[PDB]
Nucleic acid binder design. Sequence first.
RNA 1: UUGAUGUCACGGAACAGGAACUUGAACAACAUCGUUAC
RNA 2: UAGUAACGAUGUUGUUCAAGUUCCU
Length: 1536
Amino acid sequence: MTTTMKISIEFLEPFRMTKWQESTRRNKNNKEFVRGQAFARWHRNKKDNTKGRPYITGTLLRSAVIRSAENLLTLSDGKISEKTCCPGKFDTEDKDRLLQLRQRSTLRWTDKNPCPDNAETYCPFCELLGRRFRIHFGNLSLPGKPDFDGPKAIGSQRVLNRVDFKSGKAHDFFKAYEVDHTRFPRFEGEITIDNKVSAEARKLLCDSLKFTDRLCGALCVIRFDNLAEKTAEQIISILDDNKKTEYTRLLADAIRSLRRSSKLVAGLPKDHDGKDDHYLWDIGKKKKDENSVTIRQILTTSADTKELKNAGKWREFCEKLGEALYLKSKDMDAEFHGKPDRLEKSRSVSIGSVLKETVVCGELVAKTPFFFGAIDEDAKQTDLQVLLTPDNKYRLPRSAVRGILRRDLQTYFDSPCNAELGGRPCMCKTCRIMRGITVMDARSEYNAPPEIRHRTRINPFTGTVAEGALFNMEVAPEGIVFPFQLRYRGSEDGLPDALKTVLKWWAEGQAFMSGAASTGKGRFRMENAKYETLDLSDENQRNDYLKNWGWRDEKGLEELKKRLNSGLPEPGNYRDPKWHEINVSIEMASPFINGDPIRAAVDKRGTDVVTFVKYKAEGEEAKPVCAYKAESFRGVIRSAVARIHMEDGVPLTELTHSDCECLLCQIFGSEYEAGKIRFEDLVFESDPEPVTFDHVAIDRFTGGAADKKKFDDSPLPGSPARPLMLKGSFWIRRDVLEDEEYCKALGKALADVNNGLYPLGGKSAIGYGQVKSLGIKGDDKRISRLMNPAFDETDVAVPEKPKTDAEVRIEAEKVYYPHYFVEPHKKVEREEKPCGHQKFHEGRLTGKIRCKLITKTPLIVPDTSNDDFFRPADKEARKEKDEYHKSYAFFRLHKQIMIPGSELRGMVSSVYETVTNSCFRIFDETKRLSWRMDADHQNVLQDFLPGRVTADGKHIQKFSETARVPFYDKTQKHFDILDEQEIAGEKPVRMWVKRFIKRLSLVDPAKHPQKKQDNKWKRRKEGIATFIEQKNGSYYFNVVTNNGCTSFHLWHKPDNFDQEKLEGIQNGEKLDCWVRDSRYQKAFQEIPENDPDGWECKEGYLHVVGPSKVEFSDKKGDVINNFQGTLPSVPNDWKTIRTNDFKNRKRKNEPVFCCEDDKGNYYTMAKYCETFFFDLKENEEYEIPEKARIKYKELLRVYNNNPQAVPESVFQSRVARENVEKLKSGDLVYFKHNEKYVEDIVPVRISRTVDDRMIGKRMSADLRPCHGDWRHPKGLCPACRLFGTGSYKGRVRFGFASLENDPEWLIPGKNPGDPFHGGPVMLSLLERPRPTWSIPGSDNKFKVPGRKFYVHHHAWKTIKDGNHPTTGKAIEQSPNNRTVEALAGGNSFSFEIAFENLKEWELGLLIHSLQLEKGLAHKLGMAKSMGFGSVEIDVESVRLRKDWKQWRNGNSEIPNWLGKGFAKLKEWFRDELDFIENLKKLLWFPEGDQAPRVCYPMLRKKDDPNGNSGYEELKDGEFKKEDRQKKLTTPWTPWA
RNA sequence: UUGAUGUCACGGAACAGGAACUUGAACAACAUCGUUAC
RNA sequence: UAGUAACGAUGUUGUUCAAGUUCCU
């Protein structure tokens, strides 16, 4: 007897949904069940398991329909069709049930009786209220009734907020799910309306259903009728296989960066030779086992698998892979909800019968990257994230637009509302409007990943970052466009004034929507405004608005967007928006860098840091542009303000801003209230192409690049020719400009910044940044009036340089050496506390210095961008891979001759650090040394005994003695009769040994004229002689010793005087003879057929190493000559090499083996024997400590890595041929013991000896790098307080030097008329330095000498000629010398030097070190072992800075400073100033008619046209072993 | 998968504070191999 | 019985980032 009507809702906006809960806290007492009553619910079948589906109840729809009906009747005076309606009833006397009352002030129309219940003919409205059910509202659910496995399958729990208004930060919050509508856009249900209801109540229900528009926080229209895990596993396996386990986080952060596109993986960088040996993109590979994969291979093959070809797949893959790697790397409260008041009765009030509706379409675009924080879980790599759509589209939620409209409305009036989440609705002026506003979401259809940014927080006590401040953040692109649609219905005749004013504000570009706005995030600007006002009061109009569901749906919206007139309605009373723009323009004079190492690691240019770059969207694609972060600029200006004002003694950079109204706490804000100034990024107005400068860290001792310390960087170029402008803006609140204290502080700070202090950018310590002029405009001279440069010009020239006093005695016929170490003192002072980079202190100085660099010897400063600068053109450029002769140019920035500031900083820092006897800034505390031990029995080889390590690597069993077995000869066969299991040293062998051979002579006492002078015939006894056979070379004999107990046969060789008794031979003659004993240590397999004498059979271990000790050469040496032609080739394998020739030919002495390869090499190989250790003594083993293992590892490392070794792999020793890395169970060892402990292990008979202590422990314990904790403590070497260190900023900045006049090259160029290019010169070999020649021995008598200052001389005339410095022979090109273009003497450069917080004596010593005495000179440039690079420096104006107004040129105080500095130096050391005497002796310059010849020695004396006793003779006599330390420390000692 | 005579949740901005920065001359001379003789 | 004496040849490149903080109020 009923009829069913089925309905269906289609959402237009992400709806919300509450959380499941068990059926016990489902009462009006749980504050979380309520406050979630107007959302959708989530039922899970099979309770206690999160598996279910969502639904919308029916009571909710009923209440919405009731409310809309109430709204509809009062709109038509209560006449439904013909009859009138009753006023309805909303009172019920019971209040135990009804977990929610009503607090809404229901409407009113045609006041009359409330139609009591005891009746029969109800009012249609009461027929709808339900006075077995007349109307039954059924549940709604999903169409197909599916089942998912949890709420996190369709939604994402996000946090919502509630901010204050005065202290505009926050309050309590609360979180609630929300589900997208592009994946669940339809529900379904039904309504069972009874038969005997009415014919108009059905119409009322139809209209009311068509009038409702929002159900669960979202607009609705109701109608009726598997790889990344294993890839990460494998990559971690690669990284742990090798020891490269510390590049893991960098790999994660760099791989995650590839999600932008899959075409970058084929563009990863390469090594410095174009090879494929990057330092992290090619880990895992090994020389052996080319089946080993590299990371680049993994990334290239997985870049194309037909499933990672779509954008979304590749992006998801990169993201999850990065997260996995990161998580692998890492392990190496007040939510107020509800309080609705349970009110008994609602205050029924009426509102009227007019209702006007206003629709405003249009769109708002972005003008600056925005930010809507939505930090989720299970993604812990970014820690400041944005809000995205399940298909990666940028959205702005409606809650944000609503909150911002509320804030702007409150700002238009001057009254903050104070609603408190409960009770009667508020009635103030700004909530009577916000109760009729409806907005909509947006999607922006951009679909591209967001960029990342890095941030820090600098500690203003040392200058570096604080312990625990470094975080990421991601910002959406700039220029994205969202659609916008706003609607308002009420009683006015259109929009109120407030809304017109606020929309005009947004139409002028001041819609500061949300985000970290303090640093210039989103600032949207509304465009293309339209509007149109409908009229719900009449009847011909309302019916149409009801016929098509208003115009909420898509087609309705499109049909309606053709009926609007353009242009917003201008207000009646404007209000002058409260944010005022200010323009900024900076101009630089140097390079500029803003670090970004991750992009550098991915980029193809192959550098280490690359400047910052941002993107901007154009609808579907981005286009990069170079910029300067806004956080950095804000920080610079803030730290400029904070170091000036005092605020009751302690400067502002020491407070904590707990509750104080500090001047900072009111312009830049704090963590208790918002700020009053907002910045913006700075675009460059140009697109300069970046450059690349190289760097290196010259060690102090043995000046030459330290290990692992080369690098580079890619800053932007800028010079006084092109000054690299910067444009920007920043907004400031209106009621700050009207103040008179704040604008004063801002003006003062910008005055400080414009004067040159506070450099913008990165490595400002070598001349980056250097702001030149900062001019702002747009504030009516309210700030731009404190920034005028005002100073004085009190002129006084600089005091002239003092006269030198250190002299040298230099003559001719003597040659000198170019190193001359400078021994240091023994006391470094470290008991002063550093100052700190806070307020400019009072008793200290701060200013600039300008100098003037003038050269007096050719100078070389190369430009290492490209080689082959001097290439003869009109020929092929180059093959892909070759070893050519590298040619360089001079340094040029924009076709201008300059000198980088780092050079000058290094030079001045070395001089100034050795003046004051300070800690070795950079130094190498590793790399234990090693020397080839000499050949002499009494000295080194007496103590090295044979041995053998046991089966367990803990003991060595010594042998007793040994003798040698000959291989490689022709007089035996030990390679064919022995197995590979004995010649390898594992199986004991039984050989025949002999110790003494015996000679024979016929006449002892008559040989005294010819023989009997060698004094070795002092143990002969007697001998009878026999004869049994005659030969062609010798005579057979038998002899007895004293009485016939021993009898030995042999073959005697006679001479002239022996022939006489031989003439008669009757084979039975008993001649008397004399036998002699000699030494003969040998061991054969069985016996030779020529010596059947007394041999002892022995047993022991045999070992061989192979054919080594080869004297190879390249010039057809002596022994190669006088051969018999047809030199054979190098055999393919040993055990086959036999001796050809003999070195001595008169007798058959030491043999050789001559061969030759295809190239011009000529080999020769002595060592025709191997050794055999026998008599393995038992019950005697020695323990191996770990020092022996370390030393042996080092020895093997030195053996197997040798650039000078023999090219033939067969002539090498066994340690180098097989690449052994550890001592195994049993092998060949010559150990050396002392009281049950071994000390050294050496593989061969004569090998190198390693020292134990690393080089770092051979200095004084106080000259090691003054580093460590040993605010900041006081323990710093005096040179690490002027120049910085790790964890303390320096206080001196150098600058790029520039040349003004004409170049005046060394040798003229190839084309005259163009005097901007020089001619090339060729240089010598210039090999690396050998720290083992100044530390000859290893025991304890040798310490580390000084700092290796090169001397001044004129040896460049020879190189300009073209001959070698030592010899006079010509020098030819090869891939080991360079060809550079150089300058000459007599050019002038000019640079600047800034400082700050200097004492009065630190400046004294610094200005001593900048300009020296009148006869000395500095030294910088390439190849200064020859004569190249000799500069002296003069100091011009020294203008100080007394206060931010004036500058007070201080030329006229230098002698005061110099005296004070020298007085301090004298205070440190009383009369122990020898090192300064030496240092002055070394910087002396040959002034005139003094041409001291210096050069490096040669190897031997027989390869120089002059014969000056090269190195091989200096090793004894003058520089023997003890006089090196002395004859090298003396400043000038002739090399003789 | 609710309950009926009473739901302003379009009733609540995930907001407020933070300098990818500190230190570092693109440079440079003597080593590398083992045994042979008595 | 029971180890002593020290000679011969002249050729050749290397490092290409390291040490720090990596999130909190």
